[PDB]
């Protein structure tokens, strides 16, 4: 079967209108790249148009630049490398996946210090994501694939013991009692509403095969099939970041051991580290942060320059209204790819300690100095 | 695909009888090249036989050597390079597309002089052609493809402003009034009659999707889907070649800007310059010329040689009822590939000024010298 | 897969030149039939051209008409039925394989009479052939297939007992002593020399896998892989045709029993009877005959006719160019398909008894009568 | 009904029994080579078994070793190189087609001397063969392909002029008068009888598409579709080898010119020279020889060695009868590949002159000496 | 890369040696059937050889005749119908799957009577099997397919409520305590040892994905992935066959409802009823029986004939000990296909009651008659 003589609409006839757009995808797509890749496909059928759909549907904001594209599976990053690499490089400022390598380091014993002054730090948490090799990512997976991811993770989790032992809840058969309890613990998540996510097809078949798992002492949380196969979280009230990270590393090694026992692996490669659906979460996909009170320093205009030089970012206390509380922020690492998880946590520990010291000095009517930029350059 | 003990006609069985032919194609086709390429095809199905058909159908005469082959699409020049390169090299005397590069230069500000003596130069004009990447050329395009060229080009032209603003006319819905007006302005073109063109399939579906566009002041003309996707022309009565060329360059840059806004590009590459359907128009595809009154000089036997050394060619005024009026010729550049458009216009300006000088000498009874050979590629 | 754009040689371009030919194949091949079948193939790859090659290579004589085509395997008769049926019908005068059926009858007990006057009949013999289902015939079999026929038959022959017990000899490892003995018994056969056979590829790989088998009392002979998988022969000096035929039938049933025990069958179907490589040997593939002395009758001018009405044929026996070395002839049945083996042997018995009677008459000076043609007996 | 789960007879099951064979093919075929190539095929379907069939069918003679295999088409030599190369190397003693190159030289002007003493040399002749690229060789060509060869060659020969002008005769429509004339001139050839040729399928469809062509003065002979597409021969009574060779070279260049005009070429490549059906005729496929009288030299015991050292071979004049013929031999070059045709003719000229010299000496009882061997190699 | 020029071993070369065999498969396989089906395959790749392997490996007992073949998937019964139909017909004495239909009836309310005299009947049970459509049967399923059957069934069972609520046990993670408990209840099963089963590949990957499920009151048992996807059993001490059958029908309808809710179905068709791996269990795959004490009637010579006429069969008790008790048998229905489950249970109820009356008559020295044959004819 073949029409062969009939004409396909040429590539340019399908080119998206990105004239009013502001996202990484739009900054790197060109007619040449589009024509070169519009015919390619991954083994499971994911296409270039499907990668960029969310970026076409969401022009963005002029003050905030989004990525604008998602991966459908592991092969996506290779097949469509001509578009993904430039985007990855811009997003992780400088990291070139074509000539550089990412190194993973989950040895919590290398952390020094790690115990924050608890009259400033309310809570500490470390988050990451993992993908199960051989199954499509949230944007492209079929119902059977999504159900396979859930069966695999749940069997592994049920093998955890000691302080990692826990319970799993399926959103589809969760009772009102359980549902309420999870909301109180701040462990529940719901159907994505962000159009950046729904346009990428990440809310299909909801709530089929999504679930929540946490250990009995409520310090280790795992989300199944939300915006990635799994989102792994270690949290605690207080400022013992070191202990939070040790539990984080221990749980991850234990979970990986258990799935390898049944023949599965995490998606990972040496140039991109752990593979996740959004290019912004490549490498370590790690967010180590604290909820900290900085009432005085938050008024000083050198604050932004301080955060920037320490490679830290701030955001509303999650439970943000028009204006979240007053002086309470969510501070976490900026970088994600090109630095190990040990290096990133250490960087957050050093940065937060410096921030606390600034706030204590402003308290004694003293003066502070802008810290010297965290190098981040070998040659 | 399976069963096949039946034999195909060998390549030589299809070889054309070129014993009485006189064109570039015939001078370079050999049994070896034919056998090597008769099986190849471009992505849209164009074949070697289709490239050379016009050359087989039109033998020629020994007094004029024709090219003898056309391109069906952009890929043609690469897939069938073993035949096209030798032809291109002979036609553009020396230019070797395998080791040389063509440079484009549309900076009218580099033009020196440019104002001819108006008692010799009646009119000035500069012409070229452009192809829209992704769509087949006139010899091979389907109706949908041809209709595509027209809507893309027409969308662009309607965005021109100022002295470049104009009007478009479709030959298929042109009224008798409009038709008459266009004939008076010398802007109309009709169904090709040259067998070199009809044998190449360039008159199919006439007049579907062909049209004419000109600015309001009638100094910028564009022909759609005639012997190329577009033929762009800048003209004026008089001898202000410089102004004619500035408008030419300005309009081309504006038109290119406008089609890139909608995702389209011109066919171009560094070894062949702009891609057009006939190999003789590669590079700049430029014809810069004047209508000049050379009554005295035209009777001198040296005239042919002077032209040759200045790399200029002459032809009839456009009036084949008598001898035009007598002494009026169309003088334009000979070269097309391997020299920028700025270099070619400058060369015409210098050559015409020298031609004018010769005329003025014969007037006062002075003698003239045959200029010395112009800029070569080292021959 | 060179190019669906390149042309195949049309059927007529491959049509054989049969203008000077005289064989059944040439009398029935037409452009229409050739075009219709030249693309067809049997499961093992046998083609129309391979079927008729021998008929193209051997034009034949205007007096004696040969068949002109062979079968490569059992399926050949069905796939190429449009050519084979007409040929079969002409050759077996009238038998139409499309509407008629052949009946096999190996019940020797039905034979009446069968003991010839030994002063006229020197020897009696009955011959036939058998093909092993699932293996290609001599014209098409590979070496492995031919070897398989040998392994299969030889295993069955070694299971014969009593007066059917015998010995097998491979032509390839036969000693000079054995060879000389077989020549004296008239049991040896050599490489085919007839161009009707070599052009049909029946002498390939000689003498690989060909052999001879005979019972101890030398009255049952079997040839392996000569001009058929097997040629089975029952012979005796004298005129006890009845005994010769009982041994023939007994041996065949025993051999068939033995190969079926190992899972093999003879090629046979109800419209064509036993399948053999030459269409002339279809049905029973049987030749029942005697060596008889007809001094006086031989020289009568009606001889050719009495034979004809009795449906008998005569041939030489003598030596180099078998003609008729003095009143001694080889008389045997003419028909082969459409009559059972019992009907054919009975017909030879009745015919020879009658022929003898003509001789006895001529000897006594009495006159002879041309018998009336034999019209269909019954079943 | 072909299952990919059913087993193919393994390669060794098809291996030929070559235990009693004596030919180049048998000396180089091994189970490993057979298994490696038995699955390969040329674009037109020629197989390994078809290449070697003649070698399997003809064991050979303990005295003279034959090649034992033929090529079906040009690609055969490449696809089955693992068997052909070793054979080619043994046959052309040393020439390794994997590391060496053959050079063609048809410049007759380089010939020094070339006029033999006509008291010893009765006649001189030079022979070779040529294949038309794109058409199968005699062992494999279909009727349509064989007919193509004839049409292409006959059209070209009809374009020859002057002393090369001639006439063509088709064996199939040759009159008895014409046949007899050709026999008297010794220009006719008939159906091959050599089993080395018939087993290789070279007598199929005889005499369809075979023919004879000669120039008017009867000094240039061409055989069409006999044991190669064409066999080209230059001959003359007497000993003017130089003139015979000039005509040979002139006619070949003229014929090649003429077929290239219609798009065809000769089969040729740099490692094997001209490609012909029998590996023994590769390179130049040239036989330059004379019919010479050597009564004394022939009875001397040093003859076989004199011939050997001069790289010449002898054979009968072609007259058997009852007691053959004395003193007249056919002497020609031994080598064929790895030396140009100019080098080979020169070698024959030098060798024959030396042979005449040993005779004139023996004719006077004098002594002669073994010449130093031509077997010197520079590169 | 399977060269279609090469020959496959003919079908007869692979034919099994069944001369000493005694099973249904051997009684119906013929060379014709084998050749016709040896090339066919099911969509998942199951072949004829795989169907019959167990029958070839196990010749059987001259006394007891086994089926000798298994199905690999649902399509098997259709693709290989030419062998299966004859076998099915012999095994279910008369039932012709080509012209007859099977009717299913699980309406327990139609049962009349059903309460056996508990001084004779120790226990009552009804068993059957079910296959999940879309997944291969035990002989052919991969590990993933087998695990899928476990996944599906288990979810369905966990949805059962009331007196059907239960617990599931995986053989692979069963504790010694649980094992022992299951052995005491007579609910455990182990790795198959019967060579009829292991030769059919039904013990592969043991104990991966096999499990046991039973309701809390221990009256409903389900075996997962043993000799079928599921074996469903209803049992009770005593003789309330009616209640046992009502629970049987209720549980089956509930289980079917639950798997259809998730998109799955049971393998079923109108000519064969429920599809299971052994042809002997087609139709209803039902075994309704009792453990009955019949000491007096187990001595009468007529007993066997009585069983036969009532279409009942007997077998040993269990935990066999040549001490404990005699007179205790396992009596159940003989028929399986061609009668509804309601008709079969009713038939067992009537037959067993007749066997109780008979015993009692014999406890009063009275005489008993041989019941008239419970025959239902159609043909």
Q: Cα distance from D336 to chain E (closest Cα, Å)?
A: 35
- Give chain A's length: 379
Nearest to A81 by CA among A313, A259, A279: A279
Same domain, A40 and A178: no
User: How remote is the C-alpha of B318 from its chain's centroid?
Assistant: 17
Which CATH number covers residue E82? 1.10.135.10
Same domain, D110 and D90: no
| Three-state DSSP class for residue D163 | helix
| CB–CB contact D148 B10 (8 Å) | yes
| Three-state DSSP class for residue C221 | strand
**Which chain C residue has its CA at the smallest distance from E14's CA?**
C263
Same domain, A201 and A282: yes
Same domain, D137 and D161: yes
Same domain, B136 and B116: yes
Q: Cα distance from C8 to chain E (closest Cα, Å)?
A: 22
Range of the domain at C227: 101-378
Chain E environment of C148 (Cβ under 8 Å): 10, 13
| CB–CB contact B263 A35 (8 Å) | no
Category of D114 on φ-ψ map: left (φ > 0), alpha (ψ -120 to 50) or beta: left
Run of H or E residues at E326:
none
Q: Cα distance from D135 to chain C (closest Cα, Å)?
A: 13
**Token code pair at residue E357:** 């009356």
Kindly provide the residue ranges of all beta strands, DSSP E only, lying in chain D, ordered along the sequence: 121-130, 166-170, 211-215, 220-224, 230-237, 268-269, 273-274, 287-293, 312-315, 328-333
Tokens 């957050």 belong to A348
Terminal-residue alpha carbon distance, chain B = 54
Experimental technique: X-ray
DSSP states along B217-265: TS-EEEEESSSSSEEEEEEEESS-HHHHHHHHHHHHHHHHHHHHHTT--
- Pairwise CA distance, residues E373 & C83, whole Å: 61
**Token code pair at residue D343:** 């080098």
Could you tell me the CA-to-CA distances from C335 to A175, A319, C285, C376 in Å, in that order? 93, 106, 9, 12
| CB–CB contact D1 E41 (8 Å) | no
Which of these three, B98, B123, B152, is where a domain ends?
B98
**For chain E, percent helix, then strand, then coil, each to nearest 5?**
35, 15, 50
Which of these three, C98, C133, C168, is where a domain ends?
C98
Q: CB neighbours of A378 closer than 8 A, spacing ≥ 6?
A: none
**Residue of B3, B5, B39 lying closest to C2 (CB–CB):** B39
- Pairwise CA distance, residues C2 & B38, whole Å: 10
Terminal-residue alpha carbon distance, chain C = 56
State the resolution, in angstroms. 2.7
- Pairwise CA distance, residues B102 & B96, whole Å: 10
Terminal-residue alpha carbon distance, chain D = 57
Torsion over CA: E70, E73, E77, E81 (sign) = negative
Which CATH number covers residue B271? 3.30.590.10
User: How buried is C219 (Cβ within 10 angstroms: 0-12 exposed, 13-18 middle, 19+ buried)?
Assistant: buried
| B287 touches B347 (CB < 8 A) | no
- Pairwise CA distance, residues D336 & D328, whole Å: 24
| Three-state DSSP class for residue B274 | strand
What is the greatest pairwise CA distance in chain C? 82
Which of these three, E98, E125, E149, is where a domain ends?
E98
- Pairwise CA distance, residues C311 & A1, whole Å: 59
How would you label E46-70 residue by residue, b for 16+ Cβ within 10 Å and e otherwise? bbbebbbbbbbebbbeeeebbbbbb
- Pairwise CA distance, residues D158 & D154, whole Å: 6
The reply to whether omega before E207 is within 30° of 0 (cis) is yes
Same domain, D158 and D261: yes
Torsion over CA: C315, C320, C321, C323 (sign) = negative
**Token code pair at residue E340:** 């509804």
CB atoms within 10 A of CB C32: 10
CB atoms within 10 A of CB D377: 6
Backbone angles phi, psi at B129, to 5 degrees: -140, 160
| A230 touches A130 (CB < 8 A) | yes
| CB–CB contact E47 D2 (8 Å) | no
Same domain, D262 and D248: yes
| D87 touches D51 (CB < 8 A) | no
| Residue D366 CA neighbour count, 13 Å, CB half | 10
What angle is formed at CA D285 by the lines to CA D280 and CA D287, rounded to 5 degrees? Answer: 105
Q: CB neighbours of C294 closer than 8 A, spacing ≥ 6?
A: C120, C303, C327, C328, C329, C355, C358, C359
Nearest to B354 by CA among D22, B346, C229, E98: B346
Nearest to C352 by CA among C205, C220, C242, C264: C242
Kindly provide the residue ranges of all beta strands, DSSP E only, lying in chain C, ordered along the sequence: 121-130, 166-170, 211-215, 220-224, 230-237, 268-269, 273-274, 287-293, 312-315, 328-333
**For chain B, percent helix, then strand, then coil, each to nearest 5?**
35, 15, 45
Run of H or E residues at C50:
helix C48-57
Same domain, C206 and C89: no
Walk across the sheet containing D287-293 and list its strands: D166-170, D211-215, D220-224, D230-237, D121-130, D287-293, D328-333, D312-315
Terminal-residue alpha carbon distance, chain A = 57
- Pairwise CA distance, residues C33 & C69, whole Å: 15
**Token code pair at residue D355:** 């042979």
What number of C-beta contacts closer than 8 Å exist between B and C? 30
Same domain, E139 and E24: no
Could you tell me the CA-to-CA distances from E2 to D41, D234, E9, E31, E37 in Å, in that order? 12, 49, 14, 26, 21
| D348 touches D284 (CB < 8 A) | no
Nearest to C333 by CA among C127, C116, C111: C127
Rg (CA), chain D: 22
Q: Cα distance from D244 to chain B (closest Cα, Å)?
A: 30
Q: What is the DSSP letter of B289?
A: E
- Pairwise CA distance, residues D25 & A148, whole Å: 60
What is the greatest pairwise CA distance in chain A? 82
CB atoms within 10 A of CB C369: 11
CB-based touch A/D (3+ pairs, under 8 A): no
Torsion over CA: B110, B112, B114, B115 (sign) = positive
**Residue of D1, D5, D47 lying closest to E47 (CB–CB):** D5
- Pairwise CA distance, residues D115 & D108, whole Å: 14
Which value, to the nearest 10 degrees, does the dihedral of the CA atoms of residues D296, D301, D304, D306 take?
-70
Same domain, B56 and B129: no
Number of domains observed in the structure of chain B: 2
DSSP states along A313-335: EEE--SS-SSS-SSSEEEEEES-
User: How buried is E360 (Cβ within 10 angstroms: 0-12 exposed, 13-18 middle, 19+ buried)?
Assistant: middle
CB-based touch B/A (3+ pairs, under 8 A): yes
Whether residue A280 is annotated as binding a ligand: the answer is: no
Which of C263, C265, C266, C267 to probe the E interface (max E CBs under 10 A)? C263
Whether residue B85 is annotated as binding a ligand: the answer is: no
The H-assigned helical ranges of C158-240 are: 176-185, 195-198
Same domain, D289 and D359: yes
Query: In terms of DSSP bridges, do strands D230-237 and D121-130 run parallel, antiparallel, or are they unpaired?
Result: antiparallel
| Three-state DSSP class for residue E268 | strand
**Which chain E residue has its CA at the smallest distance from D48's CA?**
E5
Run of H or E residues at E266:
none
Same domain, A118 and A213: yes
What angle is formed at CA A14 by the lines to CA A12 and CA A15, rounded to 5 degrees? Answer: 65
Query: In terms of DSSP bridges, do strands A328-333 and A312-315 run parallel, antiparallel, or are they unpaired?
Result: antiparallel
Q: CB neighbours of C292 closer than 8 A, spacing ≥ 6?
A: C120, C121, C122, C328, C329, C331, C352, C355, C356
- Pairwise CA distance, residues C127 & C189, whole Å: 15
CB atoms within 10 A of CB B285: 24
User: How buried is A113 (Cβ within 10 angstroms: 0-12 exposed, 13-18 middle, 19+ buried)?
Assistant: exposed
Nearest to D350 by CA among D125, D107, D114, D120: D114
- Pairwise CA distance, residues A243 & A231, whole Å: 19
Rg (CA), chain E: 22
User: How remote is the C-alpha of B274 from its chain's centroid?
Assistant: 11
Chain B environment of C15 (Cβ under 8 Å): none
Tokens 């290449």 belong to D51
CB atoms within 10 A of CB D335: 19
Tokens 């034992």 belong to D68
User: How buried is B63 (Cβ within 10 angstroms: 0-12 exposed, 13-18 middle, 19+ buried)?
Assistant: exposed
β-partners of residue B66 are: B23
| A37 touches A82 (CB < 8 A) | yes
Backbone angles phi, psi at E191, to 5 degrees: -50, 130
| Three-state DSSP class for residue E195 | helix
| A284 touches A274 (CB < 8 A) | yes
Tokens 């380089």 belong to D110
- Pairwise CA distance, residues B13 & B9, whole Å: 6
Tokens 């009349």 belong to E112
| A274 touches A159 (CB < 8 A) | no
């Amino acid at each position: 079967a073949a029409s062969e003589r009939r004409r396909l609409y040429p590539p340019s006839a399908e080119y998206p209108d990105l004239r009013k757009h502001n996202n990484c995808m739009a900054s790197h797509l060109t007619p040449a790249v589009y024509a070169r890749l519009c015919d390619k496909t991954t083994p499971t059928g994911w296409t270039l148009d499907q990668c960029i759909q969310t970026g076409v549907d969401n022009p963005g904001h002029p003050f905030i630049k989004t990525v604008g594209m998602v991966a459908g599976d592991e092969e996506t990053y290779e097949v469509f490398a001509d578009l993904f690499d430039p985007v990855i490089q811009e997003r992780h400022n400088g990291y070139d996946p074509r000539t550089m390598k990412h190194t993973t380091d989950l040895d919590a014993s290398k952390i020094r210090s790690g115990y924050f002054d608890e009259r400033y730090v309310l809570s500490s948490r470390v988050r990451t994501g993992r993908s199960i090799r051989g199954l499509s990512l949230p944007p492209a997976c079929t119902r059977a694939e999504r159900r396979e991811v859930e069966r695999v993770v749940v069997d592994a989790l049920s093998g955890l013991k000691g302080d990692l032992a826990g319970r799993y809840y399926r959103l589809s058969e969760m009772t009102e009692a359980e549902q309420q309890q999870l909301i109180d613990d701040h462990f529940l998540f719901d159907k994505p509403v962000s159009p950046l996510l729904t346009a990428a097809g990440m809310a299909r078949d909801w709530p089929d095969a999504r679930g929540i798992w946490h250990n009995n002492e409520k310090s280790f949380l795992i989300w199944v099939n939300e915006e990635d196969h799994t989102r792994v979280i270690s949290m605690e009230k207080g400022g013992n970041m070191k202990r939070v990270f040790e539990r984080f590393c221990r749980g991850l090694k234990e979970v990986e051991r258990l799935i390898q026992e049944r023949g599965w692996e995490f998606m990972w490669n040496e140039r991109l580290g752990y593979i996740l659906t959004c290019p912004s979460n490549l490498g370590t996909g790690l967010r180590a942060g604290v909820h900290i009170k900085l009432p005085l320093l938050s008024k000083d205009s050198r604050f932004p320059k301080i955060l920037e030089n320490l490679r830290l970012q701030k955001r509303g206390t999650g439970g943000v209204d028009t204006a979240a509380t007053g002086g309470v922020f969510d501070i976490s690492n900026l970088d994600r790819l090109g630095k190990s998880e040990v290096e990133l946590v250490q960087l957050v520990i050093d940065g937060v300690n410096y921030l606390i010291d600034c706030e204590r000095r402003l308290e004694r009517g003293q003066d502070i100095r802008i810290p010297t930029p965290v190098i981040h350059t070998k040659h």
